[PDB]
């Protein structure tokens, strides 16, 4: 989707907010992997 990240955002090269559109999904997926591992914290501490 990164080509698509620059396909749908071709006129936004004058816009600073194109990088926010870039910065949006990376700020999502950094959190989703935290909580998956944060499940793994409480999952291990039970087993521990």
């Amino acid at each position: 989707k990164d080509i698509d990240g620059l396909d749908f955002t071709q006129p936004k090269k004058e816009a600073i907010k194109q990088a926010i559109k870039q910065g949006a999904e990376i700020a999502r997926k950094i959190l989703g992997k935290v909580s998956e591992g944060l499940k793994y914290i409480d999952l291990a501490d039970a087993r521990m």
Binding site: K33, G37, Y40, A44
Partner: protein, 53 residues
């Protein structure tokens, strides 16, 4: 004087009654128990370091 013949038979009876065929099986139970934890903690350290980056 305690008899030399029963003093041998006392020790020889002690050498038959021994847990050595049992405790070795008991200790190899705990080592194979603790190996399962070590083989699990390697999965943990290979996961948290994956999370930490």
């Amino acid at each position: 004087a305690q008899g030399l013949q029963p003093q041998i038979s006392s020790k020889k009876k002690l050498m038959d009654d021994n847990n050595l065929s049992t405790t070795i099986k008991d200790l190899q139970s705990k080592i194979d128990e603790k190996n399962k934890e070590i083989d699990q903690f390697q999965k943990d350290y290979n996961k948290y370091v994956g999370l930490a980056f």
